[PDB]
C-alpha cells in the first residue's frame, strides 16, 4: 500500500530528473551565453597572457603546479611542452548537439608537435541513463574522446626507448633488443584509454571537471594561490 505510493513518487522523481536534465541543458545554454559575455574578459585575459595588449610567464604551467590534481601529472619532460600552453577555453556545445565541453588547449606550436590548436573533447551526461535515472546528479562526464597528436619525431613524451642485450634461444645470436614502452606524462591525458584503465579514466574526468569549473574561470585565483584546491 505505502510501498505503492513510494514507487509512484519514485516515478515522479524520475520525471523530476528528466526536468532537471532539461534544466541543466538550459544551464549549459546560459553557459554559452555567458561564455559570449566572458568573451571580452576572457579575451583580455588571453591577450595579457600572450601580451597582445597591455605576458604572464608559465601562467598555465604555474596553475598546474599549484594544484595537487594537476601538478601530479606534470613530469620533468612535461614542463618543456606544457609551459607552451598559452591559453585555455571551454567551448560549450552548440544547441541541439549532445552536451559536450571542448577543452581548448591551443598549445602555441613550438618544437614538439605540429598541432596548431589542440583539444580534449569530453562528453557530459546530457540526460539520465534509463537504467538508473537517480544517478543523474547533473552533467557528469562519461567519456573523453581525446585528440590525435601529430608528434614531431623525437619528442614523443608518451613513449621511451629501452634496449637490452639478449640472445636468440638455441641459435645464440646476440641482439640489442629495443622496445618502445609507454611513458607516464601529462600528455597521456590527450590520448586517453579507448572507451587500471578505468582508474585513469576516472582521474582524467575529475581533472577535466576541475579544470572546467575552477581552473579556467578562476585561473588568477590559482596562479596567486588565493583560492583553495577543492
Amino acid at each position: 500500500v505505502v510501498k505503492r505510493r513510494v514507487n509512484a513518487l519514485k516515478n515522479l522523481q524520475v520525471k523530476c530528473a528528466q526536468i532537471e536534465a532539461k534544466f541543466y541543458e538550459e544551464v549549459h545554454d546560459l553557459e554559452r551565453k555567458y561564455a559570449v559575455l566572458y568573451q571580452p574578459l576572457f579575451d583580455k585575459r588571453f591577450e595579457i597572457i600572450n601580451a597582445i595588449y597591455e605576458g604572464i610567464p608559465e601562467f598555465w604551467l604555474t596553475v598546474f603546479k599549484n594544484v595537487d590534481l594537476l601538478s601530479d601529472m606534470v613530469q620533468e619532460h612535461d614542463e618543456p611542452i606544457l609551459k607552451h600552453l598559452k591559453d585555455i577555453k571551454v567551448k560549450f556545445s552548440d544547441a541541439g548537439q549532445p552536451m559536450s565541453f571542448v577543452l581548448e588547449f591551443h598549445f602555441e606550436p613550438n618544437e614538439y608537435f605540429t598541432n596548431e590548436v589542440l583539444t580534449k573533447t569530453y562528453r557530459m551526461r546530457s540526460e539520465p541513463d534509463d537504467s538508473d535515472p537517480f544517478s543523474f546528479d547533473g552533467p557528469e562526464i562519461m567519456g573523453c574522446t581525446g585528440c590525435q597528436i601529430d608528434w614531431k619525431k623525437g619528442k614523443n613524451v608518451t613513449l621511451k626507448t629501452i634496449k637490452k642485450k639478449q640472445k636468440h634461444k638455441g641459435r645464440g645470436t646476440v641482439r640489442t633488443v629495443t622496445k618502445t614502452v609507454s611513458n607516464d606524462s601529462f600528455f597521456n591525458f590527450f590520448a586517453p584509454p579507448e572507451v587500471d584503465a578505468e582508474a585513469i579514466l576516472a582521474a582524467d574526468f575529475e581533472i577535466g571537471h576541475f579544470l572546467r569549473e575552477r581552473i579556467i574561470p578562476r585561473s588568477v585565483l590559482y596562479f596567486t594561490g588565493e583560492a583553495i584546491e577543492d
Binding site: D132, S135, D137, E140, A202
Partner: protein, 648 residues
C-alpha cells in the same frame, strides 16, 4: 660479538619519543618503527634491545654463560601486549597462541582438500561491508583498497567504487558522485585460492579452487608458526572477540643444548641465534652416518647423536640399522667420544624440530618436534597423536702437451662447433703463450694434441695455510666459443667431503671471477689459475662460500673459522692419501716427485701439531681433532710407505 639480530624488538630515538621497532637488515642495523614505519640504519649500541625472534628450529648460544655451547630451539612462548584498534586501551600481558589471524587463509597456510595436501600460494579475498543505510555488499579487495582490513573497521569511499560490488542485502543505493559512503567491515573472506599440491597422503586437483568448491578446504591450523610480530593485526579473544594490534613482545623459548639438557623458560635476551653454524656441529637428534676411510663399509648403518661436548668436539652417537625384514630397527651400539669430523649428516632422514612431515605408504601429517633416543622420529599426527615412528617412511617438507688425452681424464662428449676453428686455435695459441711466459712457481699445466681444448692443471698448497703442501688436480675444457664464456673447470674429488666451501666433490668448482661465485674475453687461463691458487686456497678457507665476511672480526667467525680450518686439514690429509693410491694417468710421475718430500713434510707438521705464529687459525686442537687427525695420519703414512716412498 654483535648484539642485534634479525627481527628483534628495538627501542630508539625516532622522533624524540622512544618508539619500538623491528629490525630487518642485519649487516649481511635496519629498523622499522611501530606506529609509522621508516626503515633506517641505526647504530647497534644506540638501539636498545627488548625482544628476540627466537623462532623454533633456531640454533642459539646462551648470551651470558662463558660456555659457547649451541642448542636448538624446541618451542617458543611469546608474551605480547595488544591494543584495541583505533584506541589506546592496551591489554598486557597476553600469550601469542591465543590470538588469531584476520583472514581465514594466508600465504602458505597448509590446506587439506579432497585427500590432497597443499600450500595456498596465491588467493583472492573479499571484504563484506555494511553501509550506513543498512546495505551489505561484497567488495573485492582490488577495489576495497580504494576505501579510505579487519572486523569492525570504519572506512569512507566515493559511491563509484561500489559500481562492481555485489549487493548481498539491503536497499541498493543510488551511486551518486557528489557524496561518499561510510562503511563498516563485518568480515573478511576468501574468494578463490591457488594451490600447488606438492604431495598427498592419481592426478592433482585444479591449481585454483573457487568458492563453489572452497567449502571442501579445511585448514591445517595445527601447523601454525605464525608467531606474533610487533604490528601483526590479530583477533583478541576475551577471557566476545575483537580486533587488536600487538604493541610489545617478550619471547621465552625452550632450548635443547648440545650437552642434552632441556632448559625451559629461557628469556630470549639471554639467548642469541647462530647465523653460520659449522657443518659438522651436530646437535642432539641429528641423523648422521660414519664417514671414516675404512670403518663401517655397510651403508645401512646410520647414527643419531645424543650429546656433543662443544669444547671437546667429540659427539656421542648411537648406531642403529634397519632390520632386513619388518618395519623394525636393530641397535648396533652406543659408541661415545666420536669425532664429529668422522661423522656426516645422513643424506636422507633429516628431522629438525617442528617440521611438517608426510607418511610414506591413518595419520598423514604432523610436526616433528623431538628426536627419540631410539632414533625414532616423534611425530605423525592425525590429531595430537604423539606416536613415535622411524625414518623408514617419513618425508620432510711450465706448459706441456701430450699426443693423446686419457679417456677417463680431462673432458669428453663435447662436440660443439666453434665460430671459427682457426680463430679458436689462435686463441689457444695465445693461451699457450701466456702460460709458458707465466707459471714460474706453484702452478703448472699440460694439455693434449688430440684435443687442444682439453687441459689438465696441478695446483699446490701455499705455506702457513691449512692447505699447506698437499696436492690438487683439475680437468678443464676450453669452450669452442672461448673466450666468449668462462672455461669448463672440474676438480677431481679423490675425497668424499667438501675440501673447501667452493670446491665440490661432485666436481663443479666455482669462483668469484668466473661469475658462478666477472668473466670477460680479455681474461686468460693464467688469471683463473692464479686466482684458484690465490683464493680457492686462501690462508683461512672459511669465508669464500656465501658472503661470510660479515662474520669477520666476530667471536662466531673466529670459532667457526678455526673449526673449518681443522676439518680442512683432516680432509686434505684424506685427499692426499687417496691421490697417492689412484694418481691419474695424466700426472703419475708428478704426484710422486712432489710427494717424496711434501707428504712427509705434512706428516711431520701434523705430528708437531699433536705436541708459535704459524699463520692460520687452528689452535687449540680439540679431542675430536686429535683422534681424527691421528687416524688419517696413520692411513697417510701407510699409503706413503705402500707407494714405495719411505721416510724422508
Amino acid at each position: 660479538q654483535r648484539l642485534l639480530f634479525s627481527h628483534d624488538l628495538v627501542s630508539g630515538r625516532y622522533r624524540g619519543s622512544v618508539h619500538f621497532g623491528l629490525v630487518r637488515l642485519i649487516h649481511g642495523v635496519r629498523v622499522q618503527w611501530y606506529p609509522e614505519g621508516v626503515k633506517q640504519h641505526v647504530k647497534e649500541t644506540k638501539l636498545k634491545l627488548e625482544d628476540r625472534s627466537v623462532v623454533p628450529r633456531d640454533v642459539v648460544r646462551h648470551m651470558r654463560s662463558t660456555d659457547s655451547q649451541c642448542g636448538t630451539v624446541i618451542d617458543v612462548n611469546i608474551d605480547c601486549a595488544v591494543k584495541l584498534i583505533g584506541t589506546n586501551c592496551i591489554i598486557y600481558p597476553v600469550n601469542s597462541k591465543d590470538l588469531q589471524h584476520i583472514w581465514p587463509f594466508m600465504y602458505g597456510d597448509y590446506i587439506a582438500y579432497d585427500c590432497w595436501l597443499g600450500k595456498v600460494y596465491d588467493l583472492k579475498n573479499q571484504i563484506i561491508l555494511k553501509l550506513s543505510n543498512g546495505a551489505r555488499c561484497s567488495m573485492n579487495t582490488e577495489d576495497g583498497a580504494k576505501l579510505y582490513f579487519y572486523p569492525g573497521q570504519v572506512l569512507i569511499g566515493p559511491a563509484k567504487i561500489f559500481s562492481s560490488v555485489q549487493w548481498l542485502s539491503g536497499v541498493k543505493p543510488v551511486l551518486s558522485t557528489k557524496s561518499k559512503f561510510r562503511v563498516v567491515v563485518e568480515e573478511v573472506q576468501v574468494v578463490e585460492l591457488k594451490v600447488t599440491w606438492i604431495t598427498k597422503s592419481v592426478s592433482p586437483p585444479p591449481s585454483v579452487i573457487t568458492q563453489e568448491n572452497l567449502g571442501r578446504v579445511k585448514r591445517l591450523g595445527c601447523f601454525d608458526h605464525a608467531q606474533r610480530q610487533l604490528g601483526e593485526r590479530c583477533l583478541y579473544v576475551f577471557p566476545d572477540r575483537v580486533a587488536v594490534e600487538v604493541v610489545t613482545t617478550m619471547t621465552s623459548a625452550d632450548v635443547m643444548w648440545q650437552d642434552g639438557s632441556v632448559e625451559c623458560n629461557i628469556r630470549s635476551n639471554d639467548l642469541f641465534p647462530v647465523h653460520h653454524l659449522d657443518n659438522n656441529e651436530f646437535c642432539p637428534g641429528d641423523f648422521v652416518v660414519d664417514k671414516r676411510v675404512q670403518s663401517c663399509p655397510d651403508p645401512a648403518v646410520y647414527g643419531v647423536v645424543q650429546s656433543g661436548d662443544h669444547i671437546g668436539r667429540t659427539c656421542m652417537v648411537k648406531w642403529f640399522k634397519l632390520r632386513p625384514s619388518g618395519d623394525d630397527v636393530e641397535l648396533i651400539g652406543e659408541e661415545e667420544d666420536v669425532s664429529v669430523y668422522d661423522i656426516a649428516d645422513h643424506p636422507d632422514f633429516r628431522f629438525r624440530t617442528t617440521d611438517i612431515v608426510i607418511r610414506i605408504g591413518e595419520p598423514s601429517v604432523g610436526q616433528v618436534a623431538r628426536v627419540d633416543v631410539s632414533s625414532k622420529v616423534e611425530v605423525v599426527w592425525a590429531d595430537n597423536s604423539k606416536t613415535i615412528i622411524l625414518p623408514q617412511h617419513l618425508y620432510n617438507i711450465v706448459f706441456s702437451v701430450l699426443e693423446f688425452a686419457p679417456s677417463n681424464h680431462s673432458f669428453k662428449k663435447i662436440e660443439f662447433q666453434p665460430p671459427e676453428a682457426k680463430k679458436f686455435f689462435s686463441t689457444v695459441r695465445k693461451e699457450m703463450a701466456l702460460l709458458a711466459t707465466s707459471l714460474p712457481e706453484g702452478i703448472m699445466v699440460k694439455t693434449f694434441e688430440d684435443r687442444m681444448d682439453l687441459f689438465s692443471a696441478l695446483i699446490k698448497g701455499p705455506t702457513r695455510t691449512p692447505y699447506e703442501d698437499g696436492l690438487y688436480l683439475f680437468d678443464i675444457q676450453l669452450p669452442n666459443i672461448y673466450p666468449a664464456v668462462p672455461p669448463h673447470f672440474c676438480y677431481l674429488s679423490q675425497c668424499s667431503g667438501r675440501l673447501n666451501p667452493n670446491l665440490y666433490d661432485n666436481g663443479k668448482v666455482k669462483v668469484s671471477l668466473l661469475g658462478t661465485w666477472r668473466w670477460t674475453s680479455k681474461s686468460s687461463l693464467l688469471q683463473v689459475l692464479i686466482s684458484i691458487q690465490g683464493l680457492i686456497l686462501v690462508n683461512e678457507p672459511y669465508y669464500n662460500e656465501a658472503g661470510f665476511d660479515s662474520d669477520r672480526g666476530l667471536q662466531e667467525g673466529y670459532e667457526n673459522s678455526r673449526c673449518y680450518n681443522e676439518m680442512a686439514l683432516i680432509r686434505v690429509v684424506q685427499s692426499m692419501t687417496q691421490l697417492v693410491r689412484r694418481p691419474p694417468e695424466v700426472f703419475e710421475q708428478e704426484i710422486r716427485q712432489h710427494f717424496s718430500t711434501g707428504g712427509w713434510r705434512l706428516v711431520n707438521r701434523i705430528e708437531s701439531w699433536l705436541e708459535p705464529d704459524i699463520g692460520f687459525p687452528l689452535f687449540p686442537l680439540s679431542k675430536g681433532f686429535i683422534k681424527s687427525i691421528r687416524g688419517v695420519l696413520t692411513q697417510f703414512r701407510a699409503a706413503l710407505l705402500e707407494a714405495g716412498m719411505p721416510e724422508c
